A paper describes a structure:
Replication in eukaryotes utilizes CMG helicase (Cdc45−Mcm2-7−GINS), leading and lagging strand DNA polymerases (Pol) ε and δ, Pol α-primase, PCNA clamps, the RFC clamp loader, and numerous accessory factors of less defined function. Ctf4 (Chromosome Transmission Fidelity 4) is a homo-trimer (Ctf43) that connects Pol α-primase and CMG helicase. The structures of the C-half of Ctf4 and its human orthologue AND1 reveal a disc-shaped constitutive trimer via the β-propeller domains on the N-terminal face (N-face) with the three C-terminal helical domains interacting with up to three CIP peptides on the C-face. We sought to address these questions by a combination of biochemistry and cryo-EM and found that one Ctf43 binds CMG very tight, not dynamic, and can bind 1, 2, or 3 CMG holoenzymes without steric hinderance at a 120° angle to one another.
Cryo-EM 2D averages of two CMGs bound to Ctf43 show the CMGs are held rigidly, consistent with their stable binding to Ctf43. The 3D reconstruction shows each CMG interacts with only one protomer of Ctf43, and the CMG contact is limited to one side of the Ctf43 triangle related by 120°. Hence, the two N-tier rings of the Mcm2-7 hexamers – where the dsDNAs approach for dsDNA unwinding – approximately face one another at an angle of 120° and the C-tier motor rings of the two CMGs, where the leading strand Pol ε’s bind, face outwards and away from each other. Notably, in a factory complex with two tightly bound CMGs, there would still remain a vacant CIP site in Ctf43 for binding of dynamic partner proteins, such as Pol α-primase and other CIP factors (see Discussion). The model indicates a factory complex that contains two CMGs on the sides of the Ctf4 disk, and one Pol α-primase on the C-face of the Ctf4 disk. The protein complex consisting of 26 visually observed polypeptides in this > 2 MDa factory model give no steric clash among them. This model may explain why Ctf4 has evolved to assemble a trimer, not a dimer, in order to tightly coordinate two CMG helicases, leaving one Ctf4 protomer to bind transient CIP factors such as Pol α-primase. Our dimeric CMG replication factory model suggests possible coordination of the two forks that arise from an origin of replication. In the core replication factory model, two parental duplexes can easily be engaged at the N-tiers of each CMG due to their 120° orientation, and the lagging strand is deflected off the top of the N-tier ring after embrace of the parental duplex by the zinc fingers that encircle dsDNA. The lagging strands displaced off the N-tier rings of their respective Mcm2-7 hexamers are near the center between the two CMGs. Such lagging strand positioning allows for and raises the possibility that the single Pol α-primase may prime both lagging strands.
Numbering used by the authors:
A (entry chain h): 326 to 436, 462 to 591, 597 to 650
B (entry chain j): 433 to 540
C (entry chain i): 201 to 706, 737 to 864
D (entry chain l): 24 to 103, 130 to 198, 201 to 211, 235 to 305, 319 to 339, 346 to 643, 647 to 693
E (entry chain j): 217 to 324
F (entry chain m): 260 to 414, 428 to 463
């Protein structure tokens, strides 16, 4: 449960259900089950600057004396962690768990072939305002990413719950395929750093038991012309039990399809886990992939 | 401003008990009008109850009232200035010049 | 004494060890769930009300309240094993009592009734607000210790003394200011509601003193009923009448329920129980994943009317409704859907509006005359002597999701119609006559049952010739459902054989056996009866919010506009920017009943093929040509 | 106890972030220009201040002013006697429980409210430093009464060796503080089921009073203590708020910072303001270019001349919108309400038009007749908005005839006859006689008898219904993007950050640009409009001889000069020009033709 | 409360009888001196008060030298001392929300 | 559990309301008339067991008369008497009543001469049996009623001119006036 010392035990309620998305649900039991463990205290307006800053140490102790009796009985050990922290003398305590979270989102937002140039000049520029974030001189821009981060997850969870309830994940034979053909707010999927997080939420919806077919997914989305389709692959995950050597099989196959016909395929993006495709090529993409078993 | 509540020339017996045992006929609007001028607007856009008051103060210089108290003839030297508008737009020439507002001829 | 200590032990097991109706642990379900909301309430089940009453009725009427104070401290330890640590969180529970066998009203209160459980009705008149109550009197001596513990003060009796257990002098007991918790206290005076009353006479007055977690549950103006006790505490000082050996009554209430309707039941619909957890919610999902539901549901709504389809579909759509959806710093969007019925004097239009009034959760039935323009919306009732010009609502501000009626009060049509067609246009309307300039919120729904001057086809000439209304107030609605029949042999018996069988529809096992008789009598064709059907509506309006797609919406733009062109080139009354906002709305009302948040393709064509035919069929003789148009739309 | 005092005098002379030494660097700046006030800031005050508030939560009503005695003892260190005591102002922001949890766990804790303030009382006085005389024994003392439990924190005792209660209040050596009893009202949007809103009461101190006008959004932070008035059952008391600090939004008396006006001057040099606002004002309105320009000039206005004689001109404009239902004259009017500095919305049924302007009633104390209420006196400087000018015939016309054209009312009811000031600006949106027939007959039948209201307003739009087959499909393409998908909320946020202007930026610069510059038109324009009118009247004059009557008279000719003065307030130029004025008539020349057809 | 400056010990008395003798006290009223007492409320000059409020008012106690000089409706200009009187907080007990400091002007 | 009353009925002679002065005190006189403006149903006492909490408050005192808020006779032990009282709700039976006004019939009114009236207390099972609006008869015991001027907040005509003689009782000097009123026992409505 993150960014707590910065703020929001309120929007913890979403990403407490992320943690219950690691258990057995995404909404159903938890929206009852959370109401044993949370609204025990109504969460204030003024002393909540003091109660979930200071005397939540009475309650972190209380969770510390709640989850010790949720330890031999629940045994879900994704919560207690050793971690690390720093302080500045004043200006609040800021650990490094939440701190990497602000750097990701602030890298995202904070701003023929004529659109990709004006798209590529953006990401270099907004990179630059994150590099100078390591002084004391950035204070009132530090919280800017913080308040940015706790809506982006609320943005990304707004559509993740949609594509679940659409039920367009199909286990064909090997993987599962999902094509986000069109929804709302498609603009936040050009920059690929959000996509691994969307997969990071999506690899954990299928992180139940699943005692056969531990294979990650391949998604699809499009915002711009000529169906650019920044398709990507994920990694399978372990529920804290890596014994088997599971790195990736796709880049071996990514050499294959790129070697076939060169009919508007691109590997110009840097990381090999992301390529591009054409609209009329994604359907013969998978037919080349459902038979080429290279794992 | 010619807003025609009852009080344009009267008292309406407002005393406010004047510290427990004093009743006063408080001057509405004629103690200011004395040896001066007034002006009021919108004659036809009024009720009936002001028109009976402007009858008395024109035929007679004084008002005299006994509401819940004392009959008193207090004097007043007033001079009104009027302002009204015709009713049916620009209909003055194609009809009679008289009755063109048709407020009572008690005032005309 | 001490034997009541065993009594608390003896009842506790007598409560939780048993659950009626084939187990599934009912009393264990109420407790853990109203823990999860943290709201301090419990009930008494009806079938074991009486078996919990039979050996406890002689310990009800003998003492009703001290039995309850010892009844309460066992319910702490009832849940304490289940949920611990309800001590740092408000440390307090107190029980409530469900329905009770008693009919009587305010006219019948004797001296035999007092200090006992009573049930009575009425109408809530003008009330006060919320104050804090002391409730725990820390007494303060001057010389000795000024802390005597937080006491147990009474009701309005002002319990005090001169001197005890410190000294015997006249050093008065005073106050100080730490660690005295406060409950609230809201005195509603009550008038007898002029319903079941031998008429032609006056109302009668009482007093109700509410308690802590029962504050502002009712509103100033509905009808209610209370389940209080009958405490008669006063010193004997009274000042409207002279001093006498006389006492005054005070009803301290224990619970409260709302406006009830169709008082004919025997073992159900007396409490808004509304708890859908293990068996009900598991059931409500599997009733929602079927492939003919919205075809089955709208056939199952009006149980006793064999009429044509579309009027049932629209009146299904009206109480379901879409979304009062939010927007940024810009104009809001109407989240209401308002229908209008045009009919003949003699079809069943006056009954479907009656039937929906019961099946809705809240309603009002302002009909006919007396609908004054100030009377529907808010009014300003004048002050008493030391009071202020306050604001008292009328119909609409009560009815958030209900019903009015405007048919043809021809004289009083020009009076109030300038107050209801600005309730939809300038939605959430309020006003500032001679008082404060505020604006309340009222997202109300309108239905109506207008009546043409004579017959239904008073002309081949169009609707502006038929009704006496003009265009703009008519244009706020979504659809003008119109009826018709001249002569039909087979259709008439389909009513005539249908209607005569309805007139043929004129102890623990026996209370159950009457219910199965009451269940079978509605189940001649078994069209999913009203025992469960209304119960999922209330959370079909307060728990689910739909959303839309983009790729299927633009296919109807030409279907709108080319139908906008034929209706503008040939028109009686026109469609505008208004109607299309209803096109997308009554679409998503249907998909709201799949409980699914999405919009499909299967519904938009269904929603279109409701509107277009129901618009075009009201035109003229020249309707047979337009039916050759609409199958191209289909 | 004491010594808390030593924990804070040794705390506010050194709290800083990294080498700025802030609280001495503002108290020094605040003892100079006389204000005598503080604020507090962030977390460690919170970090250890809860460790002080874990001994201040028990009674944050008596040891809140134990702060107050401290900072005077650091004040005299920055002097070297005329030294007053100080006051405190706070800050905290997590959320706003509106009016729900108000008796259980919220007696004497710090609360935060969001409300709309409606009613101010007249000022008063309570003391804070007194001098006390025993009667026949002549003791002299002095007691200070700082914070409260309303009156009677402590009393005056019997000990001076003279008689009982011998104590009297001289007025020779005394100080005083003022209280308000202004009333607060719930913001009418947060708890809808079927209810009516409630109300509370509060007081304040002098160096934060008179900071609010009625009709604003506000937020407030303070205590929830309890008094007991003896002018109802058991001994029950009442609730009230003791406020501390209003960290409000803007006033909505022209003092502000400088970086606000820097961007404004950086925007006002780019000469694209007139066309860029029409897209950026109403992000939810398909076009309507002639109407949209009439609204931006209505919001700012012209001027006011008190020219060296007795009379005056009326510097304002007042528009009308009449037309068919379904042409967005309604929902456009809610849009001007939030963007205005001061706006009311009484748009329905007149609301007892005699009680629109004034009300008098009997009084609970002293049984008196004083002035209380009005819709106009609340709405000065800004804009009202009403509708339904067909089915009000009772008093709505007789109430606006005086209220408009001179803006100087005087009530002649049973008490006073006072000419209170008014500088209002009206707006209306009616219906004609079901729309189409007034556009398919002789052009009469608009108002039932009289046109005398119509001569009093200048600008009149008459919209209609076309059937152009390409403009509807775009509209049918428009509103589905704005209904669901909310994709234009992502589109207009994308053209916001370099090209368009959001709502909270438009409000702040209108009050700045109105309250600074004062235009005047150039005498080169005097030949221009004079040559314009003589054929405009003649175009009317050629129409009357064809037996076509109705209306144009000379108020409009002195209304165009306010219209051309309006965009001079927009450009903030102290003159007016010819490309200025030719576009102005281009709005009104367009509305002269529809006055005929 | 008329000496305008010094808050002396008041004499809560109307008229004494029987000074320290056995003589029935007689009072000479020709050599007893009198003075008058008149309060008047003053509104605000309603042009220079900016548009955010109704007119307010305070009051003034004057003496004989300029009584009957003040017709209601005169642009008057007074000057005097500012003065409080009355016991606020002790003359009744518990004294919650009651101002006890009346604004007065004892002027000339 | 046993509480009774005595209900006579059917005396021969029926009077009117204008014939009730001198011999009619403590008598039995049937009275006709019509009834208007009822009131509600409150309880009475007739017997209490209140006593002071000095030592023991279990003294069932006497004399629940028209000023009965002071049980102060014969305390239990040698304790402090008339120091308090505690009117419990747990042991003293009550009886329920209502106060109504009557009016003279229409076939007897001589002229339109402001037709006078009087009031009547009905106290047994007679409660809610006089429906307002009928020509009605009554039982007949006449009764006077004072006001004792209790501890409440207060203590044209020369009324109480009789009562100026009624000064100087052992409690405070005042004027206890009187007014003729009516107590009933049994209603009937022939008509
Ligand atoms: N199709 C039908 N099925 C069953 N009952 C019907 C039908 N049509 C009419 N009735 C009966 O006729 C009775 C007469 O009421 P009806 O509905 O005709 O009033 P109405 O004509 O609708 O009144 P209004 O014109 O005021 O709406 C109703 O009680 C209803 O039971
Ligand atoms: N020109 C336009 N541009 C954008 N939206 C419009 C336009 N005209 C109407 N609308 C839409 O119409 C919707 C509902 O407005 P509504 O139907 O209440 O107008 P109306 O009040 O009926 O018009 P009128 O005031 O003439 O009766 C609003 O959501 C608004 O967006």
């Amino acid at each position: 449960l993150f960014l707590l010392r910065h703020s929001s035990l309120y929007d913890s309620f979403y990403y407490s259900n992320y943690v219950n998305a690691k258990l057995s649900l995404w909404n159903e039991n938890g929206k009852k089950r959370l109401h044993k463990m949370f609204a025990r205290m109504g969460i204030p307006l003024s002393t909540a600057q003091e109660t979930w800053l200071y005397m939540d140490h009475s309650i972190k102790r209380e969770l510390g004396i709640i989850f010790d009796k949720n330890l031999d009985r629940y045994g879900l050990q994704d919560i207690i962690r050793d971690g690390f922290v720093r302080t500045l003398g004043y200006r609040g305590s800021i650990s490094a768990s939440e701190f990497v979270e602000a750097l990701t989102a602030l890298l995202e937002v904070g701003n023929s072939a004529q659109k990709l140039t004006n798209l590529r000049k953006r990401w270099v520029s907004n990179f630059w305002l994150s590099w100078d974030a390591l002084d004391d001189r950035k204070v009132e821009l530090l919280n800017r990413g913080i308040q940015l981060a706790q809506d982006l997850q609320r943005a990304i969870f707004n559509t993740g719950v949609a594509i679940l309830e659409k039920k367009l994940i199909k286990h064909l034979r090997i993987y599962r395929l999902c094509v986000l053909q069109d929804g709302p707010d498609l603009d936040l999927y050009r920059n690929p750093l959000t996509l691994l997080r969307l997969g990071n939420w999506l690899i954990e919806c299928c992180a139940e038991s699943e005692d056969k077919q531990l294979l990650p997914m391949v998604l699809a989305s499009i915002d711009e012309n000529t169906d650019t389709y920044l398709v990507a692959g994920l990694t399978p995950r372990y529920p804290r039990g890596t014994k088997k050597p599971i790195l990736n099989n796709f880049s071996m196959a990514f050499q294959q399809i790129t070697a076939e016909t060169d009919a508007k395929v691109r590997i110009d993006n840097f990381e090999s886990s992301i390529i591009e495709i054409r609209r009329e090529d994604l359907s013969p993409f998978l037919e080349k992939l459902t038979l080429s078993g290279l794992l | 401003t010619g807003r025609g509540s009852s009080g344009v020339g009267l008292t309406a017996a407002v005393t406010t008990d004047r510290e427990t045992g004093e009743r006063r006929l408080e001057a509405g609007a004629m103690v200011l009008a004395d040896r001066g001028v007034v002006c009021i607007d919108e004659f036809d856009k009024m009720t009936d109850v002001d028109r009976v008051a402007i009858h008395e103060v024109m035929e007679q210089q004084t008002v005299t009232i006994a509401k819940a108290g004392i009959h008193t003839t207090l004097n007043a030297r007033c001079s009104v200035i009027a302002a009204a508008n015709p009713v049916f737009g620009q209909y003055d020439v194609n009809r009679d010049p008289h009755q063109n507002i048709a407020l009572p001829d008690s005032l005309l | 004494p001490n034997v009541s200590r065993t009594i608390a032990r003896e009842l506790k097991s007598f409560l939780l060890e048993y659950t009626d109706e084939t187990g599934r642990s009912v009393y264990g379900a109420r407790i853990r769930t109203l823990g999860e909301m943290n709201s301090e309430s419990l009930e008494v089940n009806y079938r074991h009300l009486a078996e919990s009453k039979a050996i406890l009725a002689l310990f009800l009427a003998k003492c009703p309240e001290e039995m309850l104070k010892i009844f309460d401290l066992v319910a702490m330890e009832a849940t304490e094993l289940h949920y611990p640590d309800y001590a740092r969180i408000h440390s307090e529970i107190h029980v409530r009592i469900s329905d009770f066998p008693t009919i009587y009203s305010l006219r019948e209160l004797r001296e035999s009734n007092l200090s006992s459980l009573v049930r009575v009705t009425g109408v809530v008149t003008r009330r006060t607000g919320v104050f804090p109550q002391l409730k725990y009197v820390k007494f303060n001596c001057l010389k000795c210790g000024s802390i005597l513990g937080p006491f147990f003060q009474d009701s309005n009796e002002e319990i005090r003394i001169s001197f005890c257990t410190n000294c015997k002098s006249k050093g008065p007991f005073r106050v100080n200011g730490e660690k005295t918790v406060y409950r609230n206290y809201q005195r509603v005076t009550l008038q007898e509601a002029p319903g079941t009353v031998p008429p032609g006479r006056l109302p009668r007055h009482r007093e109700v003193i509410l308690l802590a977690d029962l504050v502002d549950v009712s509103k100033p103006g509905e009808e209610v009923e209370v389940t209080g006790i009958y405490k008669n505490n006063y010193d004997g000082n009274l000042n409207a009448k002279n001093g006498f050996p006389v006492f005054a009554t005070i009803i301290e209430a224990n619970s409260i329920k709302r406006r009830e309707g169709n008082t004919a039941n025997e073992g159900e619909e007396g409490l808004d129980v509304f708890s859908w957890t293990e068996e009900e919610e598991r059931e409500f999902r599997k009733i929602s994943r079927d492939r003919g539901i919205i075809d089955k549901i709208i056939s199952s709504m009006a149980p006793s009317i064999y009429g044509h389809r579309d009027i049932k579909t629209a009146v299904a759509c009206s109480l379901f409704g879409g979304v009062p959806k939010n927007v940024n710093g810009k104009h809001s969007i109407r989240g209401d859907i308002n229908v209008l019925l045009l009919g003949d004097p003699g079809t069943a239009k006056s009954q479907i509006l009656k039937y929906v009034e019961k099946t809705a959760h809240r309603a009002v039935f302002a009909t006919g005359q007396g609908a004054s323009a100030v009377g529907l919306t808010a009014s300003v009732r004048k002050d008493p002597i030391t009071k202020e010009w306050t604001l008292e609502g009328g119909a609409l501000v009560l009815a958030d999701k209900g019903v009015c009626l405007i048919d043809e009060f021809d004289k009083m049509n020009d009076q109030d119609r300038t107050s209801i067609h600005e309730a939809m246009e300038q939605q959430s309307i309020s006003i500032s006559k001679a008082g404060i300039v505020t604006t309340l919120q009222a997202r109300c729904s309108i239905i109506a049952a207008a009546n043409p001057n004579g017959g239904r086809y008073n002309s081949t000439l169009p609707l502006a010739q038929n009704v006496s209304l003009t265009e703009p107030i008519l244009s706020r609605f979504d659809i003008l459902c119109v009826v018709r029949d001249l002569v039909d042999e087979e259709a008439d018996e389909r009513l005539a054989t249908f209607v005569v069988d309805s007139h043929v529809r004129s102890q623990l096992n026996a209370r159950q056996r009457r219910l199965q008789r009451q269940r079978k009598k509605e189940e001649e064709i078994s069209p999913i009866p009203q025992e469960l059907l209304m119960k999922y509506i209330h959370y079909a309006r307060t728990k689910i919010y739909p959303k839309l797609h983009q790729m299927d919406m633009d296919k109807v733009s030409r279907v709108y506009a080319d139908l906008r062109r034929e209706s503008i080139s040939t028109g009686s009354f026109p469609i505008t920017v208004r109607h299309l906002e209803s096109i997308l709305r009554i679409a998503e009302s249907f998909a709201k009943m799949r409980l699914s948040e999405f919009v499909s393709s299967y519904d938009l064509d269904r929603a279109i093929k409701v509107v277009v035919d129901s618009f075009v069929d009201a035109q003229k003789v020249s309707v047979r040509r337009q039916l050759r148009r609409s199958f191209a739309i289909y | 106890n004491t010594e808390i005092i030593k924990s804070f005098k040794n705390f506010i002379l050194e709290f800083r972030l990294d080498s700025q030494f802030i609280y001495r660097d503002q108290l020094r700046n605040n003892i100079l220009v006389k204000n005598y006030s503080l604020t507090v800031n962030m977390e460690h005050l919170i970090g250890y201040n809860e460790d002080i508030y874990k001994k201040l939560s028990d009674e944050p009503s008596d040891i809140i002013p134990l702060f107050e005695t401290a900072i005077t003892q650091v004040a005299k260190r920055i002097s070297i006697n005329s030294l007053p005591t100080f006051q405190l102002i706070l800050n905290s922001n997590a959320n706003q429980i509106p009016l729900r949890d108000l008796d259980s766990e919220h007696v004497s804790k710090i609360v935060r409210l969001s409300g709309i303030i409606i009613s101010t009382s007249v000022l008063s006085s309570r003391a804070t430093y007194l001098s006390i005389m025993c009667r026949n024994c002549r003791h002299t003392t002095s007691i200070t009464i700082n914070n409260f439990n309303t009156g009677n924190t402590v009393s005056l005792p019997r000990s001076c060796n003279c008689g009982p209660d011998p104590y009297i209040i001289i007025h020779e050596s005394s100080k005083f503080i003022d209280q308000q009893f202004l009333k607060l009202q719930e913001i009418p949007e947060l708890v809808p089921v079927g209810e009516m809103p409630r109300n509370l009461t509060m007081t304040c101190d002098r160096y934060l009073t008179n900071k609010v006008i009625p009709g604003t959004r506000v937020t407030i932070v303070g205590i929830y203590s309890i008094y007991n008035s003896k002018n109802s059952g058991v001994a029950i008391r009442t609730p009230y708020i003791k406020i501390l600090g209003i960290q409000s939004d803007v006033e909505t008396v022209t003092m502000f910072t400088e970086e606000e006006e820097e961007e404004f001057l950086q925007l006002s040099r780019n000469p694209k303001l007139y066309e860029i606002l029409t897209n950026s004002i109403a992000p939810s309105i398909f076009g309507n270019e002639d109407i949209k320009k009439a609204i931006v000039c209505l919001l700012m206005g012209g001027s006011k001349k008190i020219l060296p004689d007795g009379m005056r001109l009326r510097g304002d404009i007042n528009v009308l919108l009449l037309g068919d239902p379904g042409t967005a004259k309604s929902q456009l009017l809610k849009f001007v309400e939030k963007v205005s500095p001061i706006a009311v919305y009484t748009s329905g049924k007149g609301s007892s038009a005699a009680g629109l302007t004034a009300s008098v009633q009997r009084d609970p104390m002293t049984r008196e007749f004083y002035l209380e209420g009005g819709a106009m006196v609340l709405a000065d400087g800004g804009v009202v908005c009403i509708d339904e000018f067909d089915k009000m015939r009772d008093e709505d016309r007789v109430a606006i005839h005086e209220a408009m054209e001179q803006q100087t009312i005087s009530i002649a009811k049973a008490g006073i006859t006072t000419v209170l000031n008014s500088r209002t600006s009206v707006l209306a949106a009616a219906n004609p006689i079901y729309g189409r027939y007034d556009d398919l007959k002789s052009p009469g039948d608009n108002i039932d008898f009289q046109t005398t209201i119509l001569s009093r307003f200048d600008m009149i739009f008459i919209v209609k219904d076309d059937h152009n087959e390409e403009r509807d499909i775009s509209i049918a393409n428009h509103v589905i993007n704005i209904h669901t998908g909310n994709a234009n909320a992502m589109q207009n946020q994308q053209e916001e950050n370099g090209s368009e202007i959001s709502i909270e930026k438009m409000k702040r610069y209108i009050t700045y640009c109105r309250l600074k510059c004062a235009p005047r038109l150039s005498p080169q324009a005097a030949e221009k409009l004079s040559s314009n009118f003589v054929t405009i009247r003649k175009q009317l004059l050629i129409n009357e001889l064809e037996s076509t009557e109705r209306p144009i008279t000379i108020r409009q000719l002195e209304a165009i000069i306010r219209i051309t003065e309006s965009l001079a307030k927009l450009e903030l130029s102290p003159i007016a020009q010819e490309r200025h004025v030719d576009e102005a008539i281009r709005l009104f020349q367009a509305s002269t033709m529809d006055a005929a057809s | 409360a008329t000496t305008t400056l010094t808050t002396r010990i008041p004499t809560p008395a109307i008229y004494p009888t029987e000074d320290t003798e056995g003589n029935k006290l007689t009072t000479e009223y020709g050599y007893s001196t009198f003075i008058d007492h008149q309060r008047i409320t003053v509104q605000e000059m309603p042009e220079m008060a900016p548009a955010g409020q109704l007119p307010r008012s305070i009051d003034v106690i004057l003496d004989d030298d300029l009584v009957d000089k003040t017709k209601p409706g005169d642009r008057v200009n007074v000057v005097g001392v500012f003065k409080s009187l009355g016991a606020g907080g002790m003359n009744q007990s518990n004294s919650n929300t009651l101002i006890g400091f009346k604004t007065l002007i004892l002027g000339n | 559990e046993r509480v009774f009353q005595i209900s006579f009925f059917n005396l021969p002679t029926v009077h009117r309301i204008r014939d009730i002065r001198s011999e009619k005190i403590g008598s039995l006189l049937s009275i006709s008339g019509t009834v208007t403006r009822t009131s509600e149903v409150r309880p009475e006492l007739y017997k209490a067991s209140f006593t002071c909490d000095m030592c023991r408050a279990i003294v069932d005192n006497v004399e629940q008369s028209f000023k009965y808020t002071e049980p102060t006779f014969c305390p239990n032990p040698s304790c402090e008497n008339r120091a308090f009282w505690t009117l419990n709700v747990t042991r003293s039976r009550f009886l329920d009543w209502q106060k109504v006004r009557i009016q003279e019939n229409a076939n007897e009114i001589p002229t339109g001469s402001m037709p006078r009236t009087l009031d009547v207390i009905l106290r047994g099972d007679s409660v809610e049996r006089a429906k307002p609006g009928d020509r009605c008869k009554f039982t007949g015991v006449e009764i006077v009623v004072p006001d004792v001027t209790q501890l409440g907040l207060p203590g044209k005509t020369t009324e109480g001119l009789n009562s100026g003689v009624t000064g100087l009782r052992s409690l405070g000097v005042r004027d206890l006036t009187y007014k003729i009123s009516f107590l009933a026992c049994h209603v009937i409505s022939i008509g």
